Subunit: 91 residues, 4 copies
């Protein structure tokens, strides 16, 4: 579950990294950063896609990627950080 | 369910597209982009409504549209991407 | 329930409106707009508090106000828009 | 529960405050502010990490910290503000 959500999140972020570095001309790390803050809804206060292709892609990317990213965050905390903390609350 | 949430999400986005292109003078694609990142809470780091009508509309648009948009995202992932992935996890 | 969440959301937004217009010097509508996009997590890409008092207040405002605002959105959609749409799905 | 989530949220914010003030050169209050709006997904419309170390750290910080911060907000409202309001609804 967590492994598949992890793999799935990685693939979605790789696609965004390739898209923004190619179409929007961002350095790969900046494309990855933009993909991450976009799908987590944090957003970036400096950059917004400048091309129409970039705007359309971003719209579709958000709708398809938000659910998955939050599912991963949802499990990464409930099935990986909770116990590591819950079990660690046992005297 | 997914079909109605899909239709309902589309109508909400069409209203925002018409509103921002008319009152805030945005090109339609930019108005659609702003509507999408606003209702998904991603936000835009470059544009904020410049008119008071735009600010009031945005406030009301957020309260009314956020629930619907996330319900759609909630189903688009649970009832359309999960199985397509879950059923695909079957050896 | 919806009435109390509505009243409670209004009071929280009035406090933010008074705070930002006084301490950060924003016009009331801009202070209300900032309060709304902050508590809904949309954010504003143009304005961030400029004073240390404003930054501290914003931090506390977010932690205390986010839960309430989303509870209101949660009910405004589940107990006020769903049926109005659900009951309207009945042939 | 609320006490542990409170302590855990504080430690996560202290780490971000130390990181951004050191690597990104922000004044401590600005580093704390950035950490808070980032983990709550509000975002900041003015500042984005300028260094690659800062961008990578922010990506990891978001994935690890978002779940915890929202769990805290989730309990701070359900187990600390609801009753204080619910019990106060009793004539
Ligand atoms: Ca900006
Ligand atoms: Cs945001
Ligand atoms: Na958000
Ligand atoms: Na934002």
């Amino acid at each position: 579950e967590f492994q598949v959500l992890f793999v799935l999140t990685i693939l979605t972020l790789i696609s965004g990294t390739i898209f923004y570095s190619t179409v929007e001309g961002l350095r790969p790390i900046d494309a990855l950063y933009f993909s991450v803050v976009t799908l987590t809804t944090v957003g970036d206060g400096n950059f917004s896609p400048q091309t129409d292709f970039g705007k359309i892609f971003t719209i579709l990317y958000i709708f398809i990627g938000i659910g998955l990213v939050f599912g991963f965050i949802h499990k990464l905390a409930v099935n990986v950080q909770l116990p590591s903390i819950l079990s660690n609350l046992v005297p």
